[PDB]
Symmetry: C2
Subunit: 386 residues, 2 copies
Amino acid sequence: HCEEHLDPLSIYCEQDRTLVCGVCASLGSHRGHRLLPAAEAQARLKTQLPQQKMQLQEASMRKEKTVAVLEHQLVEVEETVRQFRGAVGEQLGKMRMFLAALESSLDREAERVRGDAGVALRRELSSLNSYLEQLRQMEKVLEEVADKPQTEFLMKFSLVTSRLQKILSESPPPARLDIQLPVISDDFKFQVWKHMFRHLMPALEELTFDPSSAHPSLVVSSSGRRVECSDQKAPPAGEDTRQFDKAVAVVAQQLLSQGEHYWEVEVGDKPRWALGVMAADASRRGRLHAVPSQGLWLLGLRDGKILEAHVEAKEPRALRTPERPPARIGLYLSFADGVLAFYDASNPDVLTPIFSFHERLPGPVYPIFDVCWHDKGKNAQPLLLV
Amino acid sequence: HCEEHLDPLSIYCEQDRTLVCGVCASLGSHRGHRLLPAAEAQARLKTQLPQQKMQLQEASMRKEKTVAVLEHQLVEVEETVRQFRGAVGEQLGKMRMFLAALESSLDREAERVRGDAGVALRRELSSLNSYLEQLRQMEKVLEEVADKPQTEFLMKFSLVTSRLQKILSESPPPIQLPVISDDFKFQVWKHMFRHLMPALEELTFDPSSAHPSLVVSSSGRRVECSDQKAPPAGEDTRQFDKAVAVVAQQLLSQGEHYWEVEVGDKPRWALGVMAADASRRGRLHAVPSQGLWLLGLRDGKILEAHVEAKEPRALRTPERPPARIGLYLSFADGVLAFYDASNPDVLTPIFSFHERLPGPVYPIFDVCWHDKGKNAQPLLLV
Ligand SMILES: [Zn+2]
Ligand SMILES: [Zn+2]
Ligand SMILES: [Zn+2]
Ligand SMILES: [Zn+2]
Ligand SMILES: [Zn+2]
């Protein structure tokens, strides 16, 4: 039963793992190998069965886990696609709503203009028709008087002449048309675009000044929305980390952590001030270095006209100063993009860029406002939360 | 017939303008006034009738003409309101069309990404399912072999082991959707500014007016200065002779227009508008008082506006030299604006004239000197 020697298979070669006969084991294929008979070789081979079963179970577990992960990824892909579609739809419907609102406002303005113009034209028509009726009556009276007897003519002619002179001196005023219809020019699209930039911003963040953190020389009135520096020399402050001691400034009660936020601060005619954000974990006392490495993103105006951005450098970076110092500053903060942008909000229709931070913000931060020293009275202008 | 003296009325008082009798004129009401007879007074009073009639006719004519004009305006009020509504609708429908197109494009991109990701993940799932099917078949083969006769066991165990080792050693080796952030609105806005412009005005260079040293190819949309010596030009006032430049065949007169010129890697060039009545030959002074509104780039990086002054006004030079310049011209507001059209997504402002332009003007392009060959880059109308 050797298939080559007609001898029954009775010897198992360990290193070849094949049944052979006695001739093959004595001389030939497996004469110098490690050879055993059935029993012990079979035992040694079945000893390896638990290892194979454990490896197979491990491989099956790994493959099933990978399949489950891929199915979870397919589900998350579907959810992500739906979320992206909905988010794009909402963000574009914002601008669509703005454009529809502008069109509606212009349409109601046109309705009012039509009504007023019609009323005014009807008034002028009534006035001129009454005046022309008076003219017609006077002309017919004159024509009838001109064909009267001598005495009646010479008695009524002067009365008729006086009446005619009176009605000719009582001419109706001109009463200019005044067609108050807003005419559109070619720049209408650009103006709408520049206003749409303002409508793109989020709602005005309702902030209130925190007196428990403000400098002792500052005072907060107008329901916590008007902070101003006092002209009194203040004693040194306490050992509180969250209260300013040398730099006269104040942070808001609200801490921003996530999303986008926008807020406007009115400085008016204040010659020296600063606005921005401060890290919540950074100490607020002592001499402060307005650098992002110390948790301070600030834009300042000094000497009444010099506008500086407090970027990470030895000295603040000078910026292109406008004709007049901006009277209202808008601040936009985006955590998802880590951007703090300062805009000139003096024009209610258009916001113009001042400076923007593009550095990765750790967060969360506090809105901080540095109302500087009153400087013997010429810096008593307050800071107002719009 | 005095009604007070029974004497007929025959004396007219000039300062009282009333007929009286002789008694009234001799003693009483009108004894010291200026008095005339009755018939002469009637003649003198009827002399004044034509003046009164003419004044009445003039006043009536004036008032009736004003009434007719006001009636026409009353009729036309509705037309004026309709015109304003339609103009506003068109100006806003521009942005509405842009937003609809952008939303459709984003939706198609998202659908394509979703389809590709689903196909790839299903392919990987099918591959792993086939691998697990192979594992199951091998496991069942092993379980069936483990209960075989002793000879069959000793002759198939090692083949099964080798196959299992092979299939275990040959295991298979194994987010790209753009999510929108808060700056998505601002990016859409900055892209919308470009679509706010009207259609690209199809202009073609005029060879009959260009300098003889220039050559116009690509169906009249690519003008370039050749490095070959050209013959002198003719004595035509509308053809450039010293300043190597070219104007377009089309003259803009009314409305708003926008056109883009590709300069590419050209170091020195100029673009703008020229008055149709200003002479084009000889040394030219690029000043608005002479019908020339030009923006130039020299030395590869210096950007200058040719405003009315002794020297051109230097402008903030960008990081890189602009590769495409867009020109917008509006007659209703008299504005010529130059924008950097290098980025197809966003246009950045360069300079804009806000002076009232008389018009009409020609789009003029100054492709500067060849400069011994290093200025042979062409100018292409996009
Ligand atoms: Zn044998
Ligand atoms: Zn052997
Ligand atoms: Zn608005
Ligand atoms: Zn009398
Ligand atoms: Zn008298």
